[PDB]
């Protein structure tokens, strides 16, 4: 995801829980050389990434 610059690993983990009710093993962030922050949110092994990605709209 692209995440707002003033965010936090605690808030990003809680955000994806609030929107698409999926639990998170760990959340991994970086700041791109274009101004914004990118996040690599890691799911728990009990859910499937491509199953919920179709609900997002991305494929």
């Amino acid at each position: 995801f692209i995440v707002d610059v003033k965010a936090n690993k605690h808030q990003i983990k809680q955000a994806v829980k609030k929107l698409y009710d999926i639990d998170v093993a760990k959340v991994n962030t970086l700041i791109r050389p274009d101004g914004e922050k990118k996040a690599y949110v890691r799911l728990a092994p009990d859910y499937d990434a491509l199953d919920v990605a179709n609900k997002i709209g991305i494929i």
Binding site: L19, G57, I58
Partner: protein, 122 residues
């Protein structure tokens, strides 16, 4: 497909919040549709949805404000947001009464010796 402002005046705060958060859903979905390409119809809907967020957020920020000053109407000590903000200097001016006070001697002069209306050449 329009979201007006008159109909939003006579609703409850929680229903307008329900009117607020559901509009946030496609706003997140329209940003999903922008990076996936989608269609030009959903691209122009971004501006329509974004301005509808401001319309709902205005009414929440509107109707909350005159409830605070109606509760604070008549109270001597109101918060700084509700206080009149004319300038730095106009807030530092007189009290609209204090220039109208005269001394006991100044009041004695004007009633005893008023400025008389007069004319000449008679």
């Amino acid at each position: 497909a329009k979201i007006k402002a008159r109909d939003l005046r006579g609703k409850k705060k929680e229903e307008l919040l329900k009117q607020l958060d559901d509009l946030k859903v496609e706003l997140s979905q329209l940003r999903v549709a922008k990076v996936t390409g989608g269609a030009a119809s959903k691209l122009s809907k971004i501006r329509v949805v974004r301005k509808s967020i401001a319309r709902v957020l205005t009414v929440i920020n509107q109707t909350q404000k005159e409830n605070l000053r109606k509760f604070y109407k008549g109270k001597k000590y109101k918060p700084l947001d509700l206080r009149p903000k004319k300038t730095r200097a106009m807030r530092r001016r007189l009290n609209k009464h204090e220039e109208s006070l005269k001394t006991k001697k100044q009041q004695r002069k004007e009633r005893l010796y008023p400025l008389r209306k007069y004319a000449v050449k008679a």
